[PDB]
């Protein structure tokens, strides 16, 4: 009969929950999820451009020139590198890369390269453009690196001192590589080479270093009882690279020049293929568009992107308690 | 809940209520009525709506985990470099974690302290010209038209004059 | 404290309450009675528990220091690997400190809170047939034997039977 | 005299006391302690089996085979290495091992070893089997290590070109080592290796290392002016190992087989004694049995552990404010 | 507020009470005062006091980035040394931002519940005896000079002898 | 007209504002800035003592003693380093500085040095003090490093191997330095050191190090294309310095005995100057005196400082909402 107000609040159909510090599984009426569980499957372009995929070929199989991977020589950009493990070829001549991890590394923060011819061994007074059964090209042949040059003895039992210099023009620093070719035997040692122990001197204004073969029997690799060690070095804006050797030396033919930086990523993948596809944020997993602050696709990741939490699920209460509903 | 009002001493939410979080049901002569508060909600919505905000503010500072290679002699670096990632996406994890648990325990209390402010505003309001009923509702001692109704809605109502 | 509760307009606590955090005293012709209130208690014990189980699965997460060693020439290296281990430690220590200072300082607030709820929960349904002593205790304005005293506690008492 | 209701709640005589954000000393009705302070302090088992304790030998006059560590000769497992500082073998002929850290650590990493033969140096053209004053046997006579063999001439005044080849087929990846003897004068290069230079070569299917000697007169250490340089590498599953000397090599005898994972750690402690006890958390500071969240014994700790700080106490508040009682 | 007590049922501050945060203002036949309330306005003091302290205390924990050089063959190290750098400066800008946006909000609301128990124990003293006006005034039913305000105000007032 | 009692609180012309995590700029009646952005911009003096400015030299050139840094000759301590990025002088004469970083660290991570001579060379059999074009003094004529000694052969065609002892009796560890001399020509090899090839031994009682010349002609630098490799070592309390050469080396002459530990800080900075002050705390960007918790400095300081934030404030609340005054 008397005349009535009452105060009271929303009551809905949500069947969202959230936990709190004191209870678990609160029913609410509003709820927003922060972490994001959606992503594409693949490896796409960002703003620094397009993956370079390596499916055939390891990065020190580019740089050095084996001839399976002759179709890496063009001048070429990324935004990052997707090496699959499963790529093949490596260093095809059995050996080691010298401070390998910090050449992939220096090679793929750029963001380029253009290949710079640093020397012309036809000219040179040495058999050049040696060739190994280790090192086949992809048309059968036996072939050898493009990047550095078999340098052997002239026909005539002829080996002497020679020395060349390059001198870095280009409009940034070049990474130039070498080899020293280690025979198994000293009787090999004086059939390619002519000399029982060479000098082979590779110096730049910074740089001075200098090699002499270790003769002795390796173990078997590849059909080679030989061994090559390989070496790489970074020619500065305006710095002079001079080479001086009488054997022994796998001889720099081809630098290259980087240009600016990438992602800085070499992702080590298999089974994610590459997109045709743009976003702002790519993780290792996929690539991610949401604007909720996390994500638990990968804590490997580039551009803009959600914080990584290992979690399905963090649900933050908006509204109130969602309670059985009461007639007004 | 902390401040006993939602789920408290008024039992039950409207289903009714759509547009808003808080708000009036009356009973006069002339009929009834229920609508949201539009002040009290929107004054709720600002503040959540801040919270948010610097959530997402204090979560988006820039963050970038390089992956890195490691040759067979250099696993003590390898290890290192591996704990400095596990250790601090460990501490990122205990961050996003805890503040949900914390800012969900405080959010529906907010909540609850906007309903007890609005009946407290309105008891106040009506004084010694209203009897309690103990859950959520006031039985006015006058008649009340829908003009003396929306008087108490939007606050005017001067209890002298009755 | 917050509520104005424990150690407020209810002076001091009751020796005499062992087996629960809140409950009754009552006196009437028939006598007297003191007893822990199950409801409320059990309430409190859920939501402590719920928040003692998340302090330790947040502070358990997978973490291991693996010493290293280094030589006279990785200097640079070992002051780095030092860094990493103190400043993550310092980075615990805060978040273990402040937990601690910061729920011990919710959880005083949050009993007290239980305490007025129930408080209030007892003065709404006594409504008029009560006068309000202002020490947590009512003077009961109508004859109240120990099934009426039942009735208040467990909620069923309706006060327009007197 | 008319009836009465009362709310309270529970006074006790809890001397327990927390601190708030915005209190000291607050005495409520029941606490926890959340940082555990008591331990057994031993060096216990884990669930990955005993700890090795070295009392006499550091890890490297173990693995090189030091003639007063005969004891330690035996096939071995453990869950971590205590090594006393104390310790006083290490390579008993003076001289440094080259990457000794990463040496210790992919050893100690493992979780157990067997001595593999990988040459018998009675059938080489060489006096083998040399020894020193300054690496004496427990029993006192003049020894050397047990893991590399000091070869020398063959008596009349013989040293060529010798090689070996061992091929690891064996179920895991092989810890071998080698040693370069430098002599103080180009007189005793003569005496012992008969060539005044020398060529050494350790080489696999991946490494590829060869060693001349350093003549010149270094401070006496242990009764040598004599030097040895020490080295190590490892021999994966299926790859050869080929040794190729004319003299200056102490070649690798005896290989270490590695298997499994240990807790990976070195403790460096003197006073705590291995204990026989069995413990779910063992840290550097003693064996811990609690369910508390945090301990104080060490930030160094294996196996399922309190997280570390350094603090006494963090007791949290579980009841209430406890207040001076009063009468109902 | 979360109390509803300032800007709330006490619209506004008062200028005039300089020396205290809390206090009261009396009107009788011997004329008018105003002034801080010292109790509540000293037990206030305190936990601001003991907040300000724990916050100084927990960011002044020895701390330390020494710049470390590094060769061009050493960019990966070089790089690692700056992700600890820049990730540990990312944690502590989180921690320091976030309490003080958290404390910020608690301080203001303690402050509101300061006032809130204030009003309450005078209402719960005065009983009876006193008219809400709903503004924080009490007006007195019976004649109370400057001896039974003083009464009030340090709360030995006995509202059975009015 | 009934008698009155109201409860109120403080209101006031306060224009500080705060943030809480719900609200923007809420007036409050008192308020405290977190944050220090007050500074001194000088580099101070702290309780370690006094800066070492170089404005003229790089830290290797005082180490090694070009002769344009003779300012640095005499007995010095420092609390911190003070490197001008525009410092011109570094090694003068062409050539690296193995693990310079290294060096770099212990040198400048100790309190003081004394010079200690470790040898004269007035009395060994070779032409001591050479000079060069590339290493003149301050005063215009070429001279060389004070710190190492180039030794070439004696005037009549004569240099045979020299050899040298120095006992560290001194009260602590000293660094020691020397230099490998690789000429551009054979002939230069042979009109210098007379020997083709030498050997240069640099042995302690821990270290066994030997250097052979790799002849060859290396890019212009400083009028050279010679080239020096630049080494050192640390010689601890009671430990015997060998030197052997007959050529090619660029010898040891003084060492650094380092004394105590500084804040082990090389700030590279050029336009912050030093000052005569005294700070408890100095950052890289300047000294700040505060009790405050924070400060927006720099996150490089020593001493006891407020902890590094990136913000221009952080305002605390101490006293309530500041609201419009009503009238009591
Ligand atoms: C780099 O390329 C080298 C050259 O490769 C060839 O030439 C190029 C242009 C392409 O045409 C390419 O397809 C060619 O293979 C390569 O060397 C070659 O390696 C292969 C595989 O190891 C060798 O094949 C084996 O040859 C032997 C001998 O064959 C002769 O004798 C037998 C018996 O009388 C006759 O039956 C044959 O007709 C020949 O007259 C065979 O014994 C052997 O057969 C066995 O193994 C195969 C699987 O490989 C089985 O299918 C069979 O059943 C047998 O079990 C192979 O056929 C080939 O001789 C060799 N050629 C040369 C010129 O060296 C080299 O390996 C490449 N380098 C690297 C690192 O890969
Ligand atoms: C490796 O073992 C070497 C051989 O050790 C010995 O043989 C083995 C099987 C055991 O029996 C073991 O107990 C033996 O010691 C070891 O070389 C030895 O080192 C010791 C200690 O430096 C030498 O002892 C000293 O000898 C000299 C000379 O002694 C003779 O002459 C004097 C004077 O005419 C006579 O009095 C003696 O009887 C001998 O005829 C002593 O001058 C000297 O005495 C002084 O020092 C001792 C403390 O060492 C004091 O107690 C005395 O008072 C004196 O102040 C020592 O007795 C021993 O000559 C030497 N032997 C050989 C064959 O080299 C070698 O050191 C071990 N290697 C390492 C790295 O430890
Ligand atoms: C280490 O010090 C070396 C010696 O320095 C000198 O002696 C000391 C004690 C001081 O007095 C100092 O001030 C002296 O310089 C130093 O080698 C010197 O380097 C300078 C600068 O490169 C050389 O100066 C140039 O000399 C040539 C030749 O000069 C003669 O011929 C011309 C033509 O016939 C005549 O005009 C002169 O009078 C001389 O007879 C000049 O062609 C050249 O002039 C051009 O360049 C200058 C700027 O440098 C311009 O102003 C002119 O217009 C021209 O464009 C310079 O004057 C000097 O010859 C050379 N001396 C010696 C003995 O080597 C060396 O560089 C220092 N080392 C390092 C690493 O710095
Ligand atoms: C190949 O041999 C020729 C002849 O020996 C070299 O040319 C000589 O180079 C030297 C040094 O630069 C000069 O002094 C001579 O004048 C040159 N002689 C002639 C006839 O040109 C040439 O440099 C050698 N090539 C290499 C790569 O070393
Ligand atoms: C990422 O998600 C955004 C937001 O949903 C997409 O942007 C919308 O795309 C649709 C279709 O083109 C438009 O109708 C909306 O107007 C877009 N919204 C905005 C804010 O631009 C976007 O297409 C998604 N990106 C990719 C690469 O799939
Ligand atoms: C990210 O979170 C989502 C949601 O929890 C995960 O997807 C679930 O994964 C579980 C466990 O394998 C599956 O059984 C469910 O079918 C998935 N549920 C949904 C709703 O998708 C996802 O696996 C998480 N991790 C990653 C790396 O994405
Ligand atoms: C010890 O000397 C003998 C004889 O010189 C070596 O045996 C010869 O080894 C070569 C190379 O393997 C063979 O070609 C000869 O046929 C072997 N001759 C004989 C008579 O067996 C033997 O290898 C040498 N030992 C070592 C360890 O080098
Ligand atoms: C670690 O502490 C636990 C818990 O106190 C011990 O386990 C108890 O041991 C006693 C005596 O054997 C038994 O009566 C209890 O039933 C055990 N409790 C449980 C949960 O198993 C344990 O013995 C201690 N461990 C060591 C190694 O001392
Ligand atoms: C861990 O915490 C305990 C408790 O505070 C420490 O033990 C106390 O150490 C102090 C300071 O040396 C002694 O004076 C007391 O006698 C000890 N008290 C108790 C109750 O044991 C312990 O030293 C702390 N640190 C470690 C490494 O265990
Ligand atoms: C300079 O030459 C003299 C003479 O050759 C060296 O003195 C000789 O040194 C040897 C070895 O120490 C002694 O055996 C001789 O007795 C010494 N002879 C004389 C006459 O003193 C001297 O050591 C040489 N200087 C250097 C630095 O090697
Ligand atoms: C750093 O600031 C402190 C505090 O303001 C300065 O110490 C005060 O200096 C004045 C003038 O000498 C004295 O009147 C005060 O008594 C000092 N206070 C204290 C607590 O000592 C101090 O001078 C400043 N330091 C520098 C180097 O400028
Ligand atoms: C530290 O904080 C202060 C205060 O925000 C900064 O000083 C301001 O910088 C801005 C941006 O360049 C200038 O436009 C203002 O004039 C400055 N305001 C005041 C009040 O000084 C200071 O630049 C910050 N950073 C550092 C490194 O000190
Ligand atoms: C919401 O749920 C109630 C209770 O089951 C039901 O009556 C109502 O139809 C639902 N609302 C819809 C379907 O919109
Ligand atoms: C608890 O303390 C009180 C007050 O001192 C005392 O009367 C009582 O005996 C104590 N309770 C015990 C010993 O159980
Ligand atoms: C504070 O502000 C008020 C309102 O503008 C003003 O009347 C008063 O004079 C100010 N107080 C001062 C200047 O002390």
Same mark, same amino acid.
């Given at each position: 009969?008397?005349?009535?107000?009452?105060?009271?609040?929303?009551?809905?159909?949500?069947?969202?929950?959230?936990?709190?510090?004191?209870?678990?599984?609160?029913?609410?009426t509003?709820?927003?999820?922060?972490?994001?569980?959606?992503?594409?499957?693949?490896?796409?372009?960002?703003?620094?451009?397009?993956?370079?995929?390596?499916?055939?070929?390891?990065?020190?199989?580019?740089?050095?020139?084996?001839?399976?991977?002759?179709?890496?020589?063009?001048?070429?950009?990324?935004?990052?590198?997707?090496?699959?493990?499963?790529?093949?070829?490596?260093?095809?001549?059995?050996?080691?890369?010298?401070?390998?991890?910090?050449?992939?590394?220096?090679?793929?923060?750029?963001?380029?390269?253009?290949?710079?011819?640093?020397?012309? /061994?036809?000219?040179? =007074?040495?058999? !050049? &453009?040696? +060739?190994?059964?280790?090192? %086949?090209? #992809?048309?059968?042949?036996?072939?050898?690196?493009?990047?550095?040059?078999?340098?052997?003895?002239?026909?005539?039992?002829?080996?002497?001192?020679?020395?060349?210099?390059?001198?870095?023009?280009?409009?940034?620093?070049?990474?130039?590589?070498?080899?020293?070719?280690?025979?198994?035997?000293?009787?090999?040692?004086?059939?390619? /080479?002519?000399?029982? =122990?060479?000098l !082979? &001197?590779? +110096?730049?204004?910074?740089? %001075?270093? #200098?090699?002499?073969?270790?003769?002795?029997?390796?173990?078997?690799?590849?059909?080679?009882?030989?061994?090559?060690?390989?070496?790489?070095?970074?020619?500065?804006?305006?710095?002079?690279?001079?080479?001086?050797?009488?054997?022994?030396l796998?001889?720099?033919?081809?630098?290259?020049?980087?240009?600016?930086?990438?992602?800085?990523r070499?992702?080590? =993948?298999?089974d994610?293929?590459?997109?045709?596809?743009?976003?702002?944020?790519?993780?290792?997993?996929?690539?991610?568009?949401?604007?909720?602050?996390?994500?638990?696709?990968?804590?490997?990741?580039?551009?803009?992107?959600?914080?990584?939490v290992k979690?399905?699920?963090?649900?933050?209460?908006?509204?109130?308690?969602?309670?059985?509903?009461?007639?007004? | 809940?902390?401040?006993?009002?939602?789920?408290?001493?008024?039992?039950?939410?409207?289903?009714?209520?759509?547009?808003?979080?808080?708000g009036?049901?009356?009973?006069?002569?002339?009929?009834?009525?229920?609508?949201?508060?539009?002040?009290?909600?929107?004054?709720?919505?600002?503040?959540?709506?801040?919270?948010?905000?610097?959530?997402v503010?204090?979560?988006?500072?820039?963050?970038?985990?390089?992956?890195?290679?490691?040759?067979?002699?250099?696993?003590?670096?390898?290890?290192?470099?591996?704990?400095?990632?596990?250790?601090?996406?460990?501490?990122?994890?205990?961050?996003?974690?805890?503040?949900?648990?914390?800012?969900?325990?405080?959010?529906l209390?907010?909540?609850?302290?906007?309903?007890?402010?609005?009946?407290?505003?309105?008891?106040?309001?009506?004084?010694?010209?209203?009897?309690?009923?103990?859950?959520?509702?006031?039985?006015?001692?006058?008649?009340?038209n829908?003009?003396?109704?929306?008087?108490?809605?939007?606050?005017?109502?001067?209890?002298?004059?009755?």
């Amino acid at each position: 009969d008397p005349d009535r107000i009452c105060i009271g609040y929303q009551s809905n159909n949500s069947t969202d929950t959230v936990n709190t510090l004191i209870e678990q599984n609160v029913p609410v009426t509003q709820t927003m999820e922060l972490v994001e569980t959606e992503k594409h499957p693949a490896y796409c372009n960002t703003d620094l451009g397009t993956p370079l995929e390596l499916r055939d070929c390891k990065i020190e199989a580019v740089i050095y020139g084996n001839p399976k991977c002759d179709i890496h020589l063009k001048d070429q950009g990324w935004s990052y590198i997707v090496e699959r493990p499963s790529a093949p070829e490596g260093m095809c001549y059995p050996g080691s890369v010298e401070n390998l991890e910090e050449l992939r590394f220096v090679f793929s923060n750029a963001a380029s390269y253009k290949r710079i011819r640093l020397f012309d /061994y036809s000219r040179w =007074n040495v058999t !050049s &453009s040696g +060739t190994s059964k280790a090192c %086949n090209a #992809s048309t059968g042949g036996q072939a050898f690196y493009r990047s550095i040059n078999w340098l052997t003895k002239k026909k005539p039992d002829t080996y002497d001192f020679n020395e060349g210099s390059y001198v870095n023009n280009e409009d940034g620093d070049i990474i130039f590589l070498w080899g020293i070719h280690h025979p198994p035997n000293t009787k090999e040692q004086t059939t390619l /080479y002519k000399n029982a =122990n060479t000098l !082979s &001197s590779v +110096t730049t204004n910074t740089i %001075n270093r #200098s090699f002499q073969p270790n003769i002795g029997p390796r173990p078997l690799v590849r059909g080679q009882q030989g061994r090559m060690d390989y070496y790489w070095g970074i020619l500065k804006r305006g710095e002079t690279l001079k080479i001086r050797t009488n054997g022994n030396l796998i001889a720099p033919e081809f630098g290259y020049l980087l240009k600016g930086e990438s992602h800085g990523r070499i992702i080590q =993948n298999e089974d994610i293929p590459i997109g045709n596809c743009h976003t702002k944020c790519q993780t290792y997993a996929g690539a991610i568009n949401s604007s909720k602050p996390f994500q638990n696709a990968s804590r490997h990741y580039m551009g803009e992107c959600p914080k990584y939490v290992k979690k399905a699920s963090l649900r933050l209460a908006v509204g109130l308690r969602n309670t059985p509903s009461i007639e007004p | 809940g902390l401040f006993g009002a939602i789920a408290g001493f008024i039992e039950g939410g409207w289903s009714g209520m759509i547009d808003g979080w808080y708000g009036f049901h009356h009973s006069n002569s002339e009929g009834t009525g229920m609508a949201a508060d539009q002040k009290s909600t929107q004054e709720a919505i600002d503040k959540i709506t801040n919270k948010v905000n610097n959530i997402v503010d204090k979560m988006n500072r820039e963050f970038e985990v390089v992956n890195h290679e490691f040759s067979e002699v250099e696993k003590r670096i390898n290890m290192i470099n591996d704990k400095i990632d596990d250790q601090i996406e460990d501490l990122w994890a205990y961050n996003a974690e805890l503040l949900v648990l914390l800012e969900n325990q405080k959010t529906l209390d907010e909540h609850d302290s906007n309903v007890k402010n609005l009946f407290d505003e309105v008891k106040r309001r009506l004084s010694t010209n209203a009897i309690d009923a103990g859950n959520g509702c006031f039985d006015i001692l006058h008649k009340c038209n829908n003009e003396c109704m929306e008087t108490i809605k939007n606050g005017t109502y001067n209890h002298k004059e009755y």
